[PDB]
Amino acid sequence: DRIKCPKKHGMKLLRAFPKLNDTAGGTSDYGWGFWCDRCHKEVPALIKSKKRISKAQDERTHAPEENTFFYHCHCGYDLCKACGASIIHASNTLKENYSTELKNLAACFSTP
Ligand SMILES: [Zn+2]
Ligand SMILES: [Zn+2]
């Protein structure tokens, strides 16, 4: 699922720094990389990792320090991979505690 910026727009996962045309403001130049609007990390270059060990590993969760991509919003709000990783983890945990609580609810209902 697409991560949203605080202004509720759906952000996009990018594998290369965007062009002037991708950000709302005129002057956003991502030539030397950007800063995460949340953990303030200065991510200066996008690197291609050769690990490739993702048969069934969410790419967004594996090797968060591996800045192989980032999330950008047109508004200009950005998230490093690491910050994206923690919201996928947190949201997956909510879905798990939901399906679990739902299976337990069905069981409590259909058990005397
Ligand atoms: Zn961050
Ligand atoms: Zn935005």
Numbering used by the authors: 567 to 678
Can you quote the paper on this entry?
Kinetoplastids are evolutionarily divergent eukaryotes that have an unconventional set of kinetochore proteins. In this study, we focused on KKT2 and KKT3, which are homologous to each other and have three domains conserved among kinetoplastids: A protein kinase domain classified as unique among known eukaryotic kinase subfamilies, a central domain of unknown function, and divergent polo boxes. In this report, we have revealed a unique zinc-binding domain in the KKT2 and KKT3 central domain, which is important for their kinetochore localization and function in T. brucei. In this study, we show that KKT2 and KKT3 are important for recruiting multiple kinetochore proteins, including KKT1, KKT4, KKT14, KKT22, and KKT23, while localization of KKT2 and KKT3 is independent from various kinetochore proteins. Together with the fact that KKT2 and KKT3 have DNA-binding motifs, these results support the hypothesis that KKT2 and KKT3 locate at the base of kinetoplastid kinetochores and play crucial roles in recruiting other kinetochore proteins.
Perkinsela is a highly divergent endosymbiotic kinetoplastid that lives inside Paramoeba. Our sequence alignment suggests that PkKKT2a and PkKKT2b have a CL-like domain but lack a C2H2 zinc finger. We determined the crystal structure of PkKKT2a551–679 at 2.9-Å resolution by Zn-SAD phasing, which confirmed the presence of a CL-like structure: Two β-sheets (residues 551–647), followed by an extended C-terminal α-helix (residues 648–679). The CL-like domain of PkKKT2a overlaps closely with that of BsKKT2 (RMSD: 0.79 Å across 39 Cα), with the exception of some differences being localized to the loop insertion and the absence of a C2H2 domain in PkKKT2a551–679, consistent with our sequence analysis. Taken together, our structures have revealed that the CL domain is conserved in BsKKT2 and PkKKT2a. Our fluorescence polarization assay showed that PkKKT2a551–679 has DNA-binding activity with a dissociation constant (Kd) of ∼500 nM on three DNA probes that have different GC contents (50 mer CEN is 50-bp DNA sequence from the CIR147 centromere repeat in T. brucei). To assess the importance of the CL domain for DNA binding, we next performed a fluorescence polarization assay for PkKKT2a551–679, which has mutations in zinc-coordinating residues (C646 and C649, corresponding to C616 and C619 in TbKKT2) and found that it has a similar DNA-binding affinity compared with WT PkKKT2a551–679. Taken together, these data have established that the CL domain is essential for the function of TbKKT2, which is consistent with the presence of CL, but not C2H2 zinc finger, in Perkinsela KKT2a.
